[PDB]
Amino acid sequence: MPSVNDSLDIVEKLYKDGVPVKEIAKRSNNSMSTVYKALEKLEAMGRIKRRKGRYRQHRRLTEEELATIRELYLKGATVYEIARQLGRPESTIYYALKKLGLKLE
């Protein structure tokens, strides 16, 4: 059986799972031009596309999360709400506001 095709399932599995190109490049150990080139090919077939659900990631208080947490302002959610949203118990949340330089409790 093919070996190069095997890894293709892993690299693509990450992107569709919710991983940025910059990260996928490291995981797959490929170049930005190599990984991205695969995504465009997979999405065209529907390998990475049409995939949703719940999956853990190694991203916390990231630029992407900071934009999602702010939602608590529009929805009016509380610290207990954002906790379940970001997927953190409470400690992490403290770092979000703290690191931001705002007030919290």
Six token digits for residue 91: 């400690």
- The structure's method of determination equals NMR
What domains appear along the chain, each with residue ranges and CATH number? 1-56 (1.10.10.60), 57-105 (1.10.10.60)
Please count the other Cβ atoms lying within 10 Å of the Cβ belonging to residue 104.
Answer: 10
Q: What is the DSSP string of 5-46?
A: HHHHHHHHHHHHHH--HHHHHHHHT--HHHHHHHHHHHHHHT
* 90 neighbors 83 (Cβ within 8 angstroms): yes
Who's near 78: CB < 8 A, 6+ residues apart?
A: 72
Question: Tell me, what amino acid is at 41?
Answer: K
* 82 neighbors 72 (Cβ within 8 angstroms): yes
Six token digits for residue 47: 């390998």
Who's near 97: CB < 8 A, 6+ residues apart?
A: 103, 104
Angstrom distances, CA of residue 58 to CA of 1, 34, 38, 74, 78: 32, 22, 22, 26, 24
Phi-psi region of 51 (alpha: psi -120 to 50; beta: other; left: phi over 0): beta
